[PDB]
C-alpha cells in the first residue's frame, strides 16, 4: 500500500525504497508521511 504512482522496489539495503515514475523521485520514508 503506497501513494498512487509510487513503485516499491526492494534494494540490497535490506530496504524497500519508494519510487515515483511520474515525478521522478525516490524516498526511504513512505511518501504518505512526506507529501
Amino acid at each position: 500500500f503506497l501513494p498512487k504512482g509510487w513503485e516499491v522496489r526492494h534494494a540490497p539495503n535490506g530496504r524497500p525504497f519508494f519510487i515515483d515514475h511520474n515525478t521522478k523521485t525516490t524516498t526511504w520514508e513512505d511518501p504518505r508521511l512526506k507529501i
Binding site: 515514475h21 521522478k24 525516490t26
Partner: peptide, 9 residues
C-alpha cells in the same frame, strides 16, 4: 542509507 539518483522510465 545512501539515496539512489532517480531516473526510471
Amino acid at each position: 542509507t545512501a539515496p539512489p539518483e532517480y531516473m526510471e522510465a
